[PDB]
Design a protein around this ligand. Structure first.
Ligand code: RHQ
Lengths: 182, 184
């Protein structure tokens, strides 16, 4: 079908790189043709998968974040869940590889809002945290970008070692980060 | 020198054309050598590439040995190190062949082993900063090895996932400030 493609494309982009998987591989792997595949281009197809996963993850987060009473806990839990989740973070190396290629100003308007979904989770947390008076952050957008990028760092660059080690580190991080604010 | 020339030539080939594009044939003929010699020294292209990365790690470590004199205190060394890691990758030419390589073999497990030995060397930079910082009462960290792994991966996330260079530096410096503050 049409959305037999998006599922296989996703799995290819994870299995191999952005560059390593091509429009020939995906079309061949879905019993289709370039007529079918023509989405616009590879860059769009990819960027649409990015859209799906980023939503799926933020939705999974919203249906799991009630378990965090304070925002201070929401920070730990969000970063913690990021290690375990099935969404978005498994596409990160392809996202790294993708940035180095496309540069092109046509598509990078779309990178502006998808870079802002990525950080909004923290923005909500730090803003609602200043409303709740758990901390005094004057520079939230700065901090939201930092925390987001740190965490993706730990998730991505530790994807090999034991999952409890990873979860241990990530929690020690959140502890050191939040303590840094006060 | 036929080992070092191969690594030299390999490096520049990898830079110009990328990892996947560079063939051992090229590496062989351009360094005035042979498949035999390349096999004897590196076995694979993958391993050759790792040996390059090894030499690069060493040089980075030698650079940092000299650069860290600009930081009297470890608080300062922490700030600086992270900044260098950010600024130097903005114009690090191998970075593309690395990304290519990393993603091409992070599925593969044997390669994944030796990469650890390599990343571990990069973490030591922080281990030393944090160790020495304990001994001068800059902070009190019980779990140094941990916080060193943490620092390293957080810093490299900020570097890898981010637009004008000043804002980046200002951000990274904020992170260093926040992180370093939350140990008191
Ligand atoms: C004049 C500047 N000189 C250097 C700058 C460098 O910048 C680097 C930036 C990086 N990222 C920024 C996005 C990464 C990942 C590795 C880098 C290395 C590096 C490359 C291969 C193996 C190890 C390292 C290394 O330094 O340690 C990591 C194991 C590196 C090496 C040198 C000599």
């Amino acid at each position: 079908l049409k959305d037999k493609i998006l599922g296989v494309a996703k799995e290819l982009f994870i299995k191999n790189g952005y560059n390593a998987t091509t429009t020939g591989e995906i079309v061949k792997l879905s019993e289709s043709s370039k007529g079918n595949l023509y989405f616009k281009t590879k860059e769009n197809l990819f960027l649409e998968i990015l859209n799906i996963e980023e939503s799926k993850w933020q939705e999974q987060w919203k249906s799991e974040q009630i378990k965090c009473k304070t925002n201070r806990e929401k920070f730990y839990l969000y970063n913690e869940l990021s290690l375990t989740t099935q969404y978005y973070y498994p596409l990160q190396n392809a996202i790294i590889e993708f940035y180095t290629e496309y540069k092109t100003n046509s598509i990078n308007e779309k990178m502006n809002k998808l870079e802002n979904k990525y950080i909004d989770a923290y923005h909500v947390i730090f803003k609602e945290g200043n409303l709740n008076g758990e901390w005094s952050i004057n520079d939230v957008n700065a901090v939201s970008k930092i925390a987001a990028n740190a965490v993706n760092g730990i998730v991505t660059f530790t994807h090999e070692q034991n999952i409890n080690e990873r979860i241990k580190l990530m929690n020690k991080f959140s502890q050191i980060f939040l303590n840094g604010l006060s």
